Amino acid sequence: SDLQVFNDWAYKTMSEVLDQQVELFNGATRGAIILRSAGNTGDLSEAAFWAKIQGLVRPRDPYSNADVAAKDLRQLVDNTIKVASGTPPINIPPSMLRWIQKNPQEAGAVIGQQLAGDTMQDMLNNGLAAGKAAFTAGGAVHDISAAGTGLMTQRAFNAAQRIFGDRSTDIQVWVSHSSPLFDLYDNALANAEQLYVFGTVNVRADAFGRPIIITDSPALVSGAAETLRHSTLGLTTGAILIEQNQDFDSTVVDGTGKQNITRQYQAEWSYNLGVNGYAYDIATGGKAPNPTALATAANWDKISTSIKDTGGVVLVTK
Amino acid sequence: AAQRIFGDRSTDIQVWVSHSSPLFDLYDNALANAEQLYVFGTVNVRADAFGRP
Amino acid sequence: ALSDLQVFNDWAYKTMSEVLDQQVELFNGATRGAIILRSAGNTGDLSEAAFWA
Amino acid sequence: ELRLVDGTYWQRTWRENDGQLYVDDWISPTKADGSQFDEIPFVIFGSKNN
Amino acid sequence: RPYIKFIAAEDILNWRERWVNGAKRTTLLVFREESDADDDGYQIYKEEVWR
Amino acid sequence: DSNNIKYVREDAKKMHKLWAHIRMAMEGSRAIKDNAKEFVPHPDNTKAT
């Protein structure tokens, strides 16, 4: 049985690593979400670029030029907030073979294989929530909830194409929850306009060559019961950036002066999070944002002068 | 609707073991395609749930 | 003007720390052997020797 | 990761850097004269047999 | 002239191994060296060197 | 048991046990006295509490 009697250390594979798909980085989403390993100091990383001059070209009156007002060129500044994460202390059971180093039942041996997936889940969820908040703050949100059921076959996606305008060709990823995907399948499986056959009811694209990537992130789920809302967001190339700071850490203690050896484990790490074309309002927010702080609008100032340069559009369906 | 359970990790569902009568009812429904989803040739498909036999 | 731009002040970490205030190089040999420094492990809290007065 | 498909030796690599799984594109190592391989260059010796 | 050393088991205190060009290679290696300062007197001191 | 790169064969996992005992015994007495509870059962578990 090995429970509380510990017959065979033999580690088990069905340790329930995770319950949500978290492989949505780099080539998985065609470079829409970037997960690089590049550490930086401080709690910020800002890059300054030259802003687009509004009235660079002007009408002319060669007969009487008269006076022309002067103009100056500015320098907008982006941002990349550093987010801190950690692991609560874990009471290592006394049956664990931490002392042994032959890949046995060490304290971090099991917590490491769980923590890889959990760190992936944290980065993905924080990135998705920050992207949703930034796109909402930038005015790139379209809510489709008063049009019948709430989600259409692909007419909802056409609305986001309308929002993003003529440059909408650069949107090629649709990160969405499972429920919108299954509603899309059901609409395909009963087509009002006959544009499907049996062989093509299971296409993952959106009639434009943009694959729809499915994750069950709690960031994309809002409300409950009738107020249930699903946030699907279309991302451009490098829309959401997540740079690791390669600053992992760990420590193992024991139950010193305790009735039982309460061995413990903590881990702490960090990463840089910056969405494309937006800047975290560190003065309005905090130095090390909470997941709620990241998700809160008005903490995300739009830097670019055009929506098309900003990467991403949020679509809300019920 | 059954695939709605399992959430995103529902593609790993593989096989629908079933009685004969549900399959025959499925054949009858496929033959009665008010929706334009089948032709005469491709109406006897055994696998139906997105490639699941 | 410079107001439109954003000034970014250079910084660095010299990874060095001030060592000490007083002089300690005199501790052995430098003072003609007046003060000697040895390396001897001694048990207890004492060490006694004699010379027959 | 060592793989053998269609009688061809393919290979990958997964690297873990602070809770992330990397993957490398599939490559087929070739012999000095070429012609790739037909088996996986891995042998598992043991007490009983290989 | 080249000098062959001898370093005790207790003196080697750091070694780092990685793949350089995909082979098990030693990158870092720190050991301890111990010397006796040449002062004017007859006392003995243990001046210590780290390589 | 997931379609993951770290999937370990069920047979090798069972063998890890014997592998661990063999390594524990080979390396010497100190690890055996560290896994005492495993190798030497307590004569009275009521006292072991």
Coordinates of C-alpha atoms in Angstrom, one line a residue, chain C residues 7-51:
Chain C
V7 CA 17.1 60.8 -19.1
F8 CA 18.4 57.5 -17.9
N9 CA 21.1 57.9 -15.3
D10 CA 24.0 55.4 -15.4
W11 CA 24.6 53.2 -12.4
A12 CA 26.9 50.3 -11.4
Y13 CA 27.6 47.9 -8.5
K14 CA 31.3 48.0 -7.7
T15 CA 31.0 44.7 -5.6
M16 CA 33.7 46.1 -3.3
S17 CA 33.4 47.1 0.4
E18 CA 35.6 49.3 2.6
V19 CA 37.9 47.0 4.6
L20 CA 39.0 48.6 7.8
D21 CA 40.0 51.8 9.6
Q22 CA 43.0 51.2 11.8
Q23 CA 46.3 49.6 10.9
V24 CA 46.8 45.8 11.5
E25 CA 49.8 45.0 9.2
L26 CA 52.1 45.4 12.3
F27 CA 50.7 42.4 13.9
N28 CA 53.6 40.0 13.4
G29 CA 57.1 40.3 12.0
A30 CA 56.6 43.9 10.9
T31 CA 57.2 45.1 14.5
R32 CA 60.7 43.3 14.7
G33 CA 59.0 40.3 16.2
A34 CA 57.6 42.2 19.2
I35 CA 54.1 40.9 18.8
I36 CA 54.0 37.4 17.3
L37 CA 51.1 35.6 15.8
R38 CA 51.0 31.8 15.9
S39 CA 48.6 29.0 14.9
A40 CA 48.2 26.6 17.8
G41 CA 45.0 24.7 18.8
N42 CA 44.8 24.7 22.6
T43 CA 42.2 22.7 24.6
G44 CA 40.4 24.0 27.6
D45 CA 40.6 27.7 28.4
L46 CA 44.2 27.8 29.7
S47 CA 47.7 26.8 29.0
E48 CA 50.4 26.6 31.8
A49 CA 54.2 26.1 31.7
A50 CA 57.0 26.3 34.2
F51 CA 60.8 27.2 34.5

